[PDB]
Design an enzyme around this catalytic site. Sequence first.
Site, PDB file in Angstrom:
ATOM      1  N   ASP A   1       0.826  -1.243   0.000  1.00 35.51           N
ATOM      2  CA  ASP A   1       0.000   0.000   0.000  1.00 35.51           C
ATOM      3  C   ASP A   1       0.854   1.285   0.000  1.00 35.51           C
ATOM      4  OD1 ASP A   1       0.914   0.067   2.603  1.00 35.51           O
ATOM      5  OD2 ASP A   1      -0.967  -0.608   3.464  1.00 35.51           O
TER       6      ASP A   1
ATOM      7  N   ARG B   1       1.006   6.805   0.234  1.00 32.74           N
ATOM      8  CA  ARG B   1       0.203   5.829   1.000  1.00 32.74           C
ATOM      9  C   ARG B   1      -1.190   5.782   0.370  1.00 32.74           C
ATOM     10  NH1 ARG B   1      -2.598   2.550   3.364  1.00 32.74           N
ATOM     11  NH2 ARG B   1      -2.169   1.671   5.418  1.00 32.74           N
TER      12      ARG B   1
ATOM     13  N   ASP C   1      -5.515  -1.212   3.755  1.00 30.49           N
ATOM     14  CA  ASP C   1      -4.433  -1.719   4.620  1.00 30.49           C
ATOM     15  C   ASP C   1      -3.998  -3.084   4.103  1.00 30.49           C
ATOM     16  OD1 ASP C   1      -2.627  -1.734   6.762  1.00 30.49           O
ATOM     17  OD2 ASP C   1      -4.066  -2.794   7.996  1.00 30.49           O
ATOM     18  N   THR C   2      -2.818  -3.148   3.512  1.00 32.56           N
ATOM     19  CA  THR C   2      -2.182  -4.423   3.131  1.00 32.56           C
ATOM     20  C   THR C   2      -1.429  -4.967   4.328  1.00 32.56           C
ATOM     21  OG1 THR C   2      -0.404  -3.102   2.234  1.00 32.56           O
ATOM     22  CG2 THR C   2      -2.014  -4.015   0.663  1.00 32.56           C
TER      23      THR C   2
ATOM     24  N   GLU D   1       1.690  -6.237   6.405  1.00 33.43           N
ATOM     25  CA  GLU D   1       3.127  -5.881   6.362  1.00 33.43           C
ATOM     26  C   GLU D   1       3.821  -7.078   5.713  1.00 33.43           C
ATOM     27  OE1 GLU D   1       3.679  -2.596   7.289  1.00 33.43           O
ATOM     28  OE2 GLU D   1       1.520  -2.670   7.744  1.00 33.43           O
TER      29      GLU D   1
ATOM     30  N   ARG E   1       3.931  11.273   3.955  1.00 29.12           N
ATOM     31  CA  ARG E   1       3.530  10.480   2.767  1.00 29.12           C
ATOM     32  C   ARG E   1       2.335  11.156   2.095  1.00 29.12           C
ATOM     33  NH1 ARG E   1       2.736   4.664   5.468  1.00 29.12           N
ATOM     34  NH2 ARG E   1       1.224   6.060   6.469  1.00 29.12           N
TER      35      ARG E   1
HETATM   36  C1  LIG Z   1      -4.112   5.393   5.202  1.00 29.14           C
HETATM   37  C2  LIG Z   1      -3.766   6.473   6.219  1.00 29.14           C
HETATM   38  C3  LIG Z   1      -2.833   6.248   7.227  1.00 29.14           C
HETATM   39  N1  LIG Z   1      -2.559   7.216   8.113  1.00 29.14           N
HETATM   40  C4  LIG Z   1      -1.597   6.975   9.173  1.00 29.14           C
HETATM   41  C5  LIG Z   1      -2.384   6.389  10.329  1.00 29.14           C
HETATM   42  C6  LIG Z   1      -1.435   5.372  10.904  1.00 29.14           C
HETATM   43  O1  LIG Z   1      -0.819   6.012  12.038  1.00 29.14           O
HETATM   44  P1  LIG Z   1       0.010   5.167  13.138  1.00 29.14           P
HETATM   45  O2  LIG Z   1       1.396   4.975  12.575  1.00 29.14           O
HETATM   46  O3  LIG Z   1      -0.027   6.125  14.268  1.00 29.14           O
HETATM   47  O4  LIG Z   1      -0.754   3.885  13.289  1.00 29.14           O
HETATM   48  C7  LIG Z   1      -0.467   5.017   9.777  1.00 29.14           C
HETATM   49  C8  LIG Z   1      -0.746   3.664   9.104  1.00 29.14           C
HETATM   50  O5  LIG Z   1       0.073   3.460   7.946  1.00 29.14           O
HETATM   51  P2  LIG Z   1       0.713   2.013   7.559  1.00 29.14           P
HETATM   52  O6  LIG Z   1      -0.418   0.989   7.409  1.00 29.14           O
HETATM   53  O7  LIG Z   1       1.411   2.315   6.266  1.00 29.14           O
HETATM   54  O8  LIG Z   1       1.576   1.638   8.707  1.00 29.14           O
HETATM   55  O9  LIG Z   1      -0.607   6.018   8.803  1.00 29.14           O
HETATM   56  C9  LIG Z   1      -3.219   8.476   8.042  1.00 29.14           C
HETATM   57  O10 LIG Z   1      -2.946   9.379   8.862  1.00 29.14           O
HETATM   58  N2  LIG Z   1      -4.119   8.730   7.066  1.00 29.14           N
HETATM   59  C10 LIG Z   1      -4.432   7.788   6.172  1.00 29.14           C
HETATM   60  O11 LIG Z   1      -5.276   8.013   5.288  1.00 29.14           O
HETATM   61 CA   LIG Z   2      -0.058  -1.495   5.704  1.00 28.99          CA
END
Ligand SMILES: Cc1cn([C@H]2C[C@H](OP(=O)(O)O)[C@@H](COP(=O)(O)O)O2)c(=O)[nH]c1=O
Ligand SMILES: [Ca+2]
EC number: 3.1.31.1
Length: 129
Positions: A15, A29, A34-35, A37, A75
Site C-alpha cells: 500500500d 500511501r 491496509d495491506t 506488512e 507520505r
Molecule cells: C491510510 C492512512 C494512514 N494514516 C496513518 C495512520 C497510521 O498512524 P500510526 O502509525 O499512528 O498507526 C499510519 C498507518 O500506515 P501504515 O499501514 O502504512 O503503517 O498512517 C493516516 O494518517 N491517514 C491515512 O489516510
Molecule cells: Ca499497511
Amino acid sequence: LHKEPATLIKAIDGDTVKLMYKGQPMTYRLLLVDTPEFNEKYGPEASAFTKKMVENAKKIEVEFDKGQRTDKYGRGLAYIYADGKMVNEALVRQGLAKVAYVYKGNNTHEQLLRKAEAQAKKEKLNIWS
Ligand SMILES: Cc1cn([C@H]2C[C@H](OP(=O)(O)O)[C@@H](COP(=O)(O)O)O2)c(=O)[nH]c1=O
Ligand SMILES: [Ca+2]
C-alpha cells in the site's frame, strides 16, 4: 475528484509506492486500504500484486481526495490508477487489502472499496480464506 499525471520511481510494498509528481519524488500511501506488512501473511503477495500492477502500467495517475494530501509521516495520500484501473480497489477486490483508515473528508471511494471487499470476502479470496 481529478486524475493527475505521475511516473513510477519505485514499488515499495502492498500500500505504498514511490512516484514522481509535478517533477518531485514523493512516497504515496494508498487511501482507505491496509495491506499486511511484508513479513505478515499475504504481505509478500500484496507487495508483488501492487509492484507488478504499477511496474507494468504505461500510464500512472494520482487522484487526491477532498481533505489533506499528506499524512503525519509526510507520505502523499491518494487513489492511484494503473492504466485507468485503481490499485486501491484492485488489492481489496483480490482480498490482498482490507478497507481501513476511513477518515471523514478523505473517503470519496469508501462504498466502492467496501463493495469490492464484500465480493473478495464472498469469494473467500486470500485474506478472507
Ligand atoms: C491510510 C492512512 C494512514 N494514516 C496513518 C495512520 C497510521 O498512524 P500510526 O502509525 O499512528 O498507526 C499510519 C498507518 O500506515 P501504515 O499501514 O502504512 O503503517 O498512517 C493516516 O494518517 N491517514 C491515512 O489516510
Ligand atoms: Ca499497511
